């Protein structure tokens, strides 16, 4: 089989021009799609903030309308899902992963309009969920669609387009070209056997959707933190310590989110009316909270820059943390359409900033700025819950642009994945998929 | 399905045994790389020192510059040809082979040969890069601790070999990310599934990067300052630049390969004509490393200078041609030392050139040529070696102008596409494929 290898080596990197062109298209589409989804959620969140002014005096009358529209939008979303496409609830990242191992369907004719409008509902009412869930899943189907509509044949072309789509989807969600590509080749491809995903193809698709994003969002970064200070070597240990805390806590959080799905299922028993009401209940809570205590609701992106600067008290930071662990669970677990990715970054930052404050005070000789621990902690929860550190690390580096913290960032990430492994937690997506694949079988 | 559920719930459980061993592999490879780094400095220094002792009498100095580059060149070409022929050239191809389990990993031989051999070739100012030596050296360090500790298993063998090569690259450019990415882009068995543990690779890299920062802290290999931005009405120019590197990348591969062929005839495989021809080329280098410094050397020096746009356009064309010549001569002649670094230098110079033209055909775009330099820097790595993701990241880690990520990506992709469509192969897969055939043939 040596001869056989000389045959493949000399043949390497020859992805059919057919598939390369289709990636371009997939990326462009997924990009636009994501841009549009992005705009919708802004609009709806803005209406809600508009209506709130119109009832600015009567206080309980205002707390009322904040709830009732988030409630109405949540419901509208939970419904579109439960009725027309149950497989597009929760994240959908686990679902696209299954598609790659060829173990779940890719019902685009259903998912596309459901995930899109459904999330537009849940996200738009200020629920604690992330744009990426909808965009990553949405993107995978857009890649399925152009594979069907163009009747492209062969394992390569099917796995490749489904991949470039999911990439372009993430890329467009954070304006993160690299994170997107890295996502496919770290956590997205079939994890146990070889696959024929063309990385060049993924590239084009991401390039296209990043352009599309930049054409409409140009000149305003999702997060803007300024250039933070540096990291002396006699400081690196502190980041390892921070990694361990995330590592013992990452697995716990996973238990919680899973058990929480189980527990919330008893409330509606699987019943589409108790669900859609319980959904509008949680959603209503969010829009109310998005007004009386705004940092406990929402996606989370607003308070990153605030926490990193060190503008929250320690008490406030503890508050925000607890409040958000509660709302992030409540929203994702209850199977609303929308990812868990983004709110995790938020918890990381807040936790890290907290550690940072303590750190800064026990070690004045180190001349610390708590805002670095915030950045090292930001993608740390993704490292211990998700178990895709390389991807989380690069994602943060593309959004916070303080490359000088690359060593601490890495050390905290590795600190997390190690202690998440040694305290027995599984990758929260492989876990979710594993439940789904059993849930299919266990009842036959 | 009942099979997959089993694997999913079992994923990411690399034995603590292997994770610990990664840490030591990295630490070792780090130190080794640090030491190698220092040696080449020292030897280059002596050459500059002795050069002053003979500062008057011009032809007498041009003589000493040659003779010790010559003497050091030969010393290296020998250590290889005699005690470990498999450690000539890059060794990146040789480690890649080790992963497919198709080449041996003679560390007891390679370690001391590559190390001292390169210290020879590099130290005399030859146009080769530190990474060749370090990457290969790193794999063997990983082989060594696998043997010396008798670790059993396919995983533990493939993993240590990998993390070693990673920590090897990492320490070569203070590039933790580029390191890891290298393994999972261009270094793992490309066609079948393997059991390399990415977590282990991580630890190894962290350890060697710490080692490097412990001794080199407070001075970046390349320093360019924060260049300007990239308007969207400008991206097309980067795609164009990608295409030029894409038609040229395959050409270069032809040249380097055919050059290996051609240089073999001059010595016929004969260890004496080789070592002489080696000290010849190496002599040439240290002479040039004085009379026209930018044509010789690793190349890192002129990046900052070219990116600032301090070279004339004439000078840039000169540097380019001169270097295409010396880079071929040096790597093709099997001298121990990688081809990575000098490639970065060519890209920069080529890009900066394009930049200048670009800047005066489009004053409305308000261009700064220095960005085309940076987008072109890892473009040659994209079209010759064909690992763009790894090249792109590497540059980003050394130049730190993340704001150019899109143009960088576009030029990269522009290259890999046109290298594909004009028939070139991955220069590393090509070299390996020559070696394996030259074996069963």
């Amino acid at each position, epitope marked *: 089989r040596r001869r056989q290898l000389i045959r493949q080596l000399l043949e390497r990197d020859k992805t059919p021009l057919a598939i390369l062109f289709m990636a371009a298209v997939v990326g462009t589409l997924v990009g636009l799609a994501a841009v549009a989804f992005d705009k919708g959620v802004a609009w709806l969140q803005n209406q809600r903030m508009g209506a709130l002014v119109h009832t600015a005096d009567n206080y309980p009358l205002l707390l009322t309308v904040a709830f009732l529209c988030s409630a109405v939008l949540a419901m509208f979303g939970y419904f579109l899902v439960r009725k027309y496409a149950p497989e597009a609830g929760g994240s959908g990242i686990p679902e696209i992963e299954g598609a790659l191992e060829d173990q779940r369907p890719v019902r685009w004719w259903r998912v596309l309009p459901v995930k899109f409008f459904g999330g537009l509902g849940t996200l738009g009412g200020g629920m604690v969920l992330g744009r990426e869930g909808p965009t990553v899943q949405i993107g995978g189907n857009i890649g399925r669609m152009v594979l069907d509509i163009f009747r492209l044949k062969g394992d390569e072309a099917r796995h490749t387009l489904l991949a470039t789509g999911a990439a372009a989807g993430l890329a467009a969600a954070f304006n993160a070209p690299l994170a997107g590509i890295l996502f496919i080749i770290e956590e997205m491809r079939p994890q146990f056997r070889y696959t024929l995903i063309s990385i060049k193809a993924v590239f084009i698709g991401v390039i296209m959707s990043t352009i599309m994003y930049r*054409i409409f969002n*140009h000149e305003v970064a999702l997060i803007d933190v300024g250039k933070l200070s540096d990291a002396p070597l006699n400081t690196l240990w502190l980041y390892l310590i921070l990694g361990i805390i995330f590592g013992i806590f990452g697995p716990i959080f996973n238990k919680w989110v899973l058990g929480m799905q189980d527990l919330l299922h008893r409330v509606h028993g699987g019943n589409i009316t108790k669900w859609v009401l319980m959904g509008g209940a949680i959603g209503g809570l969010c829009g109310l909270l998005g007004f009386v205590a705004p940092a406990t609701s929402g996606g989370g992106f607003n308070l990153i820059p605030i926490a990193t600067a060190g503008n929250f008290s320690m008490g406030m930071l503890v508050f925000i943390f607890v409040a958000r662990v509660i709302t992030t669970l409540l929203c994702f677990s209850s199977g609303a359409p929308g990812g868990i990715f983004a709110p995790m970054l938020a918890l990381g930052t807040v936790l890290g900033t907290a550690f940072g404050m303590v750190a800064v005070e026990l070690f004045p000789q180190y001349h610390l700025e708590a805002g670095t621990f915030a950045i090292a902690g930001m993608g740390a929860l993704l490292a211990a819950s998700i178990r895709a550190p390389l991807t989380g690390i690069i994602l943060v580096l593309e959004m916070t642009d303080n490359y000088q913290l690359i060593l601490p960032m890495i050390i905290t990430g590795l600190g997390a994945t190690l202690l998440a492994q040694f305290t027995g937690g599984k990758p929260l997506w492989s876990a979710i998929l594993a439940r789904t694949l059993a849930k299919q079988e266990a009842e036959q | 399905r009942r099979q997959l559920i089993r694997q999913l719930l079992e994923r990411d459980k690399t034995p603590l045994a292997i994770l610990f061993m990664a840490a030591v592999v990295g630490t070792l490879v780090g130190l080794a790389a640090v030491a190698f780094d220092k040696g080449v400095a020292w030897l280059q220094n002596q050459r500059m020192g002795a050069l002053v002792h003979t500062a008057d009498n011009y032809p007498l100095l041009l003589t000493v510059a040659f003779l010790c580059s010559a003497v050091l060149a030969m010393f290296g070409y020998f250590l290889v040809r005699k005690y470990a022929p498999e450690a000539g050239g890059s060794g990146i191809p040789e480690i890649e082979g080790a992963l497919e389990d198709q080449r041996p990993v003679r560390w007891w031989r390679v370690l001391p040969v590559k190390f001292f051999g390169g210290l020879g070739t590099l130290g005399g100012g030859m146009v080769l890069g530190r990474e060749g030596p370090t990457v290969q050296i790193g794999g063997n360090i990983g082989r060594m601790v696998l043997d010396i500790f008798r670790l059993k298993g396919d995983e533990a063998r493939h993993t240590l070999l990998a993390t070693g090569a990673a920590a090897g690259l990492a320490a070569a450019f203070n590039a933790p990310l580029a390191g890891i990415l290298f393994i999972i882009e261009e270094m793992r068995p490309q066609f079948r599934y393997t059991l390399i543990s990415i977590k282990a690779v991580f630890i190894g890299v962290i350890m060697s990067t710490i080692m490097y920062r412990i001794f080199n802290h407070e001075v970046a290999l390349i320093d360019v300052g924060k260049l*300007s931005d990239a*308007p*969207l*009405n*400008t991206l097309w120019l980067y795609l164009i630049l990608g295409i030029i590197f894409g038609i040229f990348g395959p050409i270069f591969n032809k040249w380097v390969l055919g050059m290996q062929d051609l240089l073999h005839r001059v010595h016929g495989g004969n260890i004496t004509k080789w070592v002489l021809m080696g000290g010849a080329i190496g002599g040439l280098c240290g002479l040039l490393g004085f009379v026209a410094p930018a044509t010789s050397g690793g190349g890192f020096n002129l990046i900052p200078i070219a990116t600032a*746009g301090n070279f004339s356009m004439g000078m840039l064309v000169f540097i380019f041609v001169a270097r295409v010549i010396t880079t071929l001569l040096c790597f093709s002649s099997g001298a121990p030392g990688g081809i990575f670094a000098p490639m970065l230098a060519l890209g920069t110079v080529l890009g900066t050139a394009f930049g200048m033209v670009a*800047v005066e055909l489009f*004053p*409305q*775009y*308000h261009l*700064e040529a220095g960005t085309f330099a940076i987008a072109g820097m890892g473009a040659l790595l994209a079209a010759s070696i064909r690992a763009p993701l790894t090249g792109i990241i590497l540059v980003l880690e050394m130049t730190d102008n993340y704001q150019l990520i899109l143009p960088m990506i576009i030029t990269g992709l522009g290259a890999t596409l046109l290298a594909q469509f004009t028939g070139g192969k991955p220069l590393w897969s090509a070299i390996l494929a020559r070696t394996l055939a030259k074996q069963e043939a």
Partner: antibody, heavy 120, light 107 residues
Framework: VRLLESGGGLVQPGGSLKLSCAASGFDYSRYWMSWVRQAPGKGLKWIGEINPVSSTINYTPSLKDKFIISRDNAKDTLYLQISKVRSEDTALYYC??????????????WGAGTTVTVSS | DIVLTQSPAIMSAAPGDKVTMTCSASSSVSYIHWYQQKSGTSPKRWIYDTSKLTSGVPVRFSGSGSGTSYSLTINTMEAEDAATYYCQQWSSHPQTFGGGTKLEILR
């Protein structure tokens, strides 16, 4: 974010003058700077643009040194020497900070203006 | 260097009125910018890349065009709009400014 230009007034026909524009509010490297002018009750005529690293300098069609646009990043200040001055130079001079949208470039934040009066 | 000329040099119109000045250019330009020079103040980036609005510019403002002609439009002009308005291209070099349209309010 403000630009505050200065040093205009009376000049002898034929003599020269250095207008200084001090910037504040924003990082003054990073930015191309420019000068536009307006003669009384008329239109905006562009003069020159200097880049951040003082390496590219462009000018409206003009002769040898009619204009010289320097800048000194140590002081966040732009300058503009005007030479051999004829009465067509009598105008208000704006210092304006450059920037792009999709990439066709615009005069982002404008100064307040200094007035140059060519006379005996 | 592109010669830009502006529709009405001076044009009256009573608040409420939908109002449209024009920028027509000698050769072919694209993505143009519009400045507002209120009387006695300095010019202000108003509309940029032909129809995107500088921040804080009231939505009553619109831009469009292509080719050799562009227009800036106020849908229900309000009295505070009284100004000279300039258009400016930099799609070729050097850049160039319009001649101005001077909006006047009827009351």
């Amino acid at each position: 974010v403000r630009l505050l230009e200065s040093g205009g007034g009376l000049v002898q026909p034929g003599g020269s003058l250095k207008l200084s524009c001090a910037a504040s509010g924003f990082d003054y490297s990073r930015y191309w700077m420019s000068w536009v002018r307006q003669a009384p009750g008329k239109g905006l005529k562009w003069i020159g643009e200097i880049n951040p690293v003082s390496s590219t300098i462009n000018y409206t069609p003009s002769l040898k040194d009619k204009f010289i646009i320097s800048r000194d990043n140590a002081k966040d200040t732009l300058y503009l020497q005007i030479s051999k001055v004829r009465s067509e130079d009598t105008a208000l001079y704006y210092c304006a900070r450059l920037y792009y949208g999709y990439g066709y470039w615009y005069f982002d934040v404008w100064g307040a203006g200094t007035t140059v009066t060519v006379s005996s | 260097d592109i010669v830009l000329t502006q529709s009405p040099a001076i044009m009256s119109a009573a608040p409420g009125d939908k109002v449209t000045m024009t920028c027509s250019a000698s050769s072919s330009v694209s993505y143009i910018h519009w400045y507002q020079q209120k009387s006695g103040t300095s010019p202000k980036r108003w509309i940029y890349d032909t129809s995107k609005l500088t921040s804080g510019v009231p939505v009553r403002f619109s831009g469009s065009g292509s080719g050799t002609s562009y227009s800036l439009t106020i849908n229900t002009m309000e009295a505070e709009d009284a100004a000279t308005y300039y258009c400016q291209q930099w799609s070729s070099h050097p850049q160039t400014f319009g001649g101005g349209t001077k909006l006047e309010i009827l009351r």
